[PDB]
Amino acid sequence: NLDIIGKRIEKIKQEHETSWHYDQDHPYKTWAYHGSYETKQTASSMVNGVVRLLTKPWDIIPMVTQMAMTKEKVDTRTQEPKEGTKKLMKITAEWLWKELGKKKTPRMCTREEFTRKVRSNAALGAIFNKWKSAREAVEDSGFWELVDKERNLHLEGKCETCVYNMMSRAIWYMWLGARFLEFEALGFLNEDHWFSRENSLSGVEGEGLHKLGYILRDVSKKEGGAMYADDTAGWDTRITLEDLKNEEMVTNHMEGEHKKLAEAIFKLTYQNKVVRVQRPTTVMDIISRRDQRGSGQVVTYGLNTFTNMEAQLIRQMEGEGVFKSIQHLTVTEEIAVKNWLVRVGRERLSRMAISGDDCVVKPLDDRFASALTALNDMGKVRKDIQQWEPSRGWNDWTQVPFCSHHFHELIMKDGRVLVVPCRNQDELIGRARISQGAGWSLRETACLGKSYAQMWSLMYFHRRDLRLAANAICSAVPSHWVPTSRTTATHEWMTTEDMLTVWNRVWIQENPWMEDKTPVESWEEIPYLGKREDQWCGSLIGLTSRATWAKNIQTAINQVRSLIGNEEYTDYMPSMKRFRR
């Protein structure tokens, strides 16, 4: 307790000595409260005018328009798992780190790699003070002396400045220094692709939205039961102290400085936390707790993937009868569990697609559906179903939800097969109409519209309305202006290369599921969903509003071109049959 967190609390207390007071009307029950102090401040979603002016029919669709308008799960407790459950988790975690470590070497990430990340806008979840932005702190030796002070404090097993700032979500921003030390010790999990499909068998890290459907269809080819895709209620809030201890076992594979720097991240920042939260009653509360997930988002993704892979192997073990009860594992069940892992563990990992808290599992048979005792006792309670009601599985891989999508099998006029990503079109148009942050020039807004358009041309070309709207936006933005994002899966649409050339590289040349590498010569060779299927997935094809928009699209394009000014533009609309004379 206070021996590990006191120094951080001590230090904050003294910076606000004028305002320190143990408030008695504090709303916390499961967080340890320490004190309050005086502050006064808060970032709403802004509309992208370029995308909205080129999507006029959606101006009267509430599911689109409402998306641009506008903490009692975080303050709850998880119970300690039973002895049998704790044993299953420890054995599985030990085995899984070894498998992930067979073809990989843990190593520290560098000031250089960090500096390079900050000098190309990656969402590192830092705060604004002594320097303005991340870019300036990184180009100043004073910062690195603060980093050095904390670094030597961590080697000594102590912490002074690694404090979270809070803001079914919750983001835990830290100062750039604490983010660096996290990246130095644990960045290797992401930087060296520990959760690639080649390395982890269940994982999809780095795979890309154009691969995920082919991956689900490959899982579907295994003999076994339904495909299960159960969502956890508030995954980050159900991470137990036993989970954080199994995750820390990655340090058993390290040596030297690295092993000590990693052990300190887990001990001092993950298994003990100090957090500052804004309460309108506007004060700042300094609260602490031992469990739950609260790391950088990239480390969070890898450890969520690890603990989810572990949890789902155990649910598979329960379905297969490898153990009888979570109350207690007998000596001979331990050897049975170890022996299952060695004998079939790698086959069972290949039956899964796991993206952090998101999973799809094709178990050996449907006993999995009612195998709930370990899952519930680990705290991974399913969303939108009663605790002991059996899971409903999916009979067709094309119906399974994964990473906010479903996937269609689409047959090209020439016989070849595309497996394409899809989701309700209102969600796609509603997201592309939104920007985050202040000070957007018209050029920067246009280049963000262009990024959405090129993503649509690469991933959603099969949706009639999105191929047309993508062509219109790319026609309305100057041809040489470079697509941008402020927050940055593989992003092959982020390029000034011709989108037909990129489509050929992604869907034909580099597609390991496409045997015939004959390039496509025009967009007209690239198919759409059935018209009825496109309507089912939210198309406006068939509406009078949509017909007028498609017919008059050159008028909309010219409206945006007149706003941007006398720049060099390309007409991409004749790449479509209906605008081709």
List the binding residues: 150, 154, 159, 162, 169, 231-232, 234-236, 304, 357-358, 383, 406, 408, 422, 537
CB of 62 to ligand A1AM1, least distance (A): 32
Dig out the tokens for 387 from the structure: 């605790």
Candidate list 558, 570, 571, 578; residue touching ligand A1AM1; CB under 6 A: 558
Quick one: which of 384, 381, 435, 428 has its CA closest to 406? 428
- Residue 287 binds: one of Zn ion, ligand A1AM1, none (C-beta under 5 to 8 A by kind): none
What's the CA gap between 96 and 341, in Å, rounded? 9
Which one of Zn ion, ligand A1AM1, none is in contact with 415 (Cβ closer than 5 to 8 A by kind)?
Answer: none
From 86-94, 158-166, 380-388, 397-405, span contacting Zn ion (CB under 5 A) = 158-166
* Binder among 66, 330, 552, 562 for ligand A1AM1 (CB under 6 A): 562
Residue closer to Zn ion (CB basis): 34 or 273: 273
When the beta carbons of 76 and 552 are compared against ligand A1AM1, the nearer one is 552
**What CA–CA distance (Å, rounded) separates 284 from 12?**
11
Q: Does residue 561 interact with ligand A1AM1 by CB under 6 A?
A: yes
Q: Which does 537 bind (CB under 5 to 8 A by kind): Zn ion, ligand A1AM1, none?
A: Zn ion
Sites for ligand A1AM1 among residues 508-547 (CB under 6 A): none
Question: DSSP letter at 474?
Answer: H
Angle subtended at Cα 404 by Cα 490 and Cα 234, rounded to the nearest 5 degrees = 110
The nearest distance, CB 566 to ligand A1AM1, in angstroms, is: 3
Q: How far is the CB of 524 from Zn ion (least distance, A)?
A: 22
The reply on whether position 162 binds Zn ion by CB under 5 A is: yes
Comparison of 14 and 566: residue with beta carbon closer to ligand A1AM1: 566
Q: Is 550 exposed, middle or buried (0-12, 13-18, 19+ CB in 10 A)?
A: buried
Q: What is the dihedral of CA 143, 146, 151, 156, to 10 degrees?
A: 180
Q: Shortest gap between Cβ of 563 and ligand A1AM1 (angstroms)? A: 9
Partner from ligand A1AM1, Zn ion, none contacting 561, C-beta within 5 to 8 A by type: ligand A1AM1
Paired strand residues for 431: none
**Residue 168 in contact with ligand A1AM1, rule: CB under 6 A:** no
Contact partners, residue 146, CB within 8 Å, separation at least 6: 161, 177
Per the annotation, binding residues for Mg(2+) are 231-232, 357-358
Binding partner of residue 152 among Zn ion, ligand A1AM1, none, CB cut-off 5 to 8 Å per kind: none
Query: Burial level of 512, CB count in 10 A (0-12/13-18/19+)?
Result: exposed
Closest contact distance (angstroms) between CB of 459 and Zn ion is: 12
Report 199-238 residues binding ligand A1AM1 (CB under 6 A): none
Nearer residue to ligand A1AM1 within complex by CB, 254 or 476 = 476
| Nearest of 304, 274, 276, 273 to residue 290 by alpha carbon | 273
- Site size with ligand A1AM1, rule: CB under 6 A: 5
Asked whether position 468 contacts Zn ion by CB under 5 A, the answer is no
Comparing CA positions, the residue from 501, 498, 521, 499 lying closest to residue 510 is 501
Sign of CA dihedral 5, 10, 15, 21: positive
565's contact among Zn ion, ligand A1AM1, none, with CB below 5 to 8 A by partner kind, is ligand A1AM1
Q: Is position 565 an interface residue for ligand A1AM1 (rule: CB under 6 A)?
A: yes
Q: 6 CB contacts (<8 Å, ≥6 apart)? A: none
Instruction: Produce one character per residue of 167-182: b if its CB has 16 or more CB atoms within 10 Å, e if not.
Output: eeebebbbbbbbbbbb
Q: What angle do CA 473, 527, 541 make, to 5 degrees?
A: 60
Binding residue ranges for CTP: 169, 234-236, 304, 383
459 binds Zn ion (CB under 5 A): no
CB of 476 to ligand A1AM1, least distance (A): 9
Residue window 385-424: x/- pattern of binding to Zn ion, with contact defined by CB under 5 A: -------------------------------------x--
CB of 558 to ligand A1AM1, least distance (A): 4
**Separation of alpha carbons 122 and 573, rounded Å:** 34
Site for ligand A1AM1 in 96-125 (CB under 6 A): none
Q: Considering only 10-18, 61-69, 537-545, 558-566, which stretch makes contact with ligand A1AM1 by CB under 6 A?
A: 558-566
Site for ligand A1AM1 contains 566 (CB under 6 A): yes
Q: What radius of gyration do the chain's Cα atoms show?
A: 26
Q: Please list, in sequence order, all residues whose beta carbon lies within 8 angstroms of the beta carbon of residue 34, skipping any fewer than 6 positions away.
A: 9, 286, 287, 288
Q: Nearer to Zn ion by C-beta: 399 or 490? A: 399
396: three-class secondary structure by DSSP: coil
AA letter at 542: G
Cβ of residue 556: shortest distance to ligand A1AM1, in angstroms?
Answer: 11
159 binds, among ligand A1AM1, Zn ion, none (CB under 5 to 8 A by kind): Zn ion
Torsion of CA 54, 59, 65, 70, to 10 degrees: 90
Stretch that binds ligand A1AM1, among 184-192, 254-262, 465-473, 560-568 (CB under 6 A): 560-568
Query: 3-state class of 73 per DSSP?
Result: coil
In angstroms, rounded to a whole number, what is the distance separating the alpha carbons of residues 52 and 57?
Answer: 9
Residue 479 CB, nearest approach to ligand A1AM1 (Å): 12
Is-contact 230 393, C-beta < 8 A? no
Partner from Zn ion, ligand A1AM1, none binding residue 357, C-beta < 5-8 Å depending on class? none
- The widest CA-to-CA distance across the chain, in whole angstroms, is 78
> What residue 422 binds from Zn ion, ligand A1AM1, none (CB within 5 to 8 A, per partner kind)?
Zn ion
How many angstroms from the chain centroid is the CA of residue 401?
15
Q: Where on the chain is the footprint of ligand A1AM1 (CB under 6 A)?
A: 558, 561-562, 565-566
- Would you tell me which residues interact with Zn ion (CB under 5 A)? 150, 159, 162, 422, 537
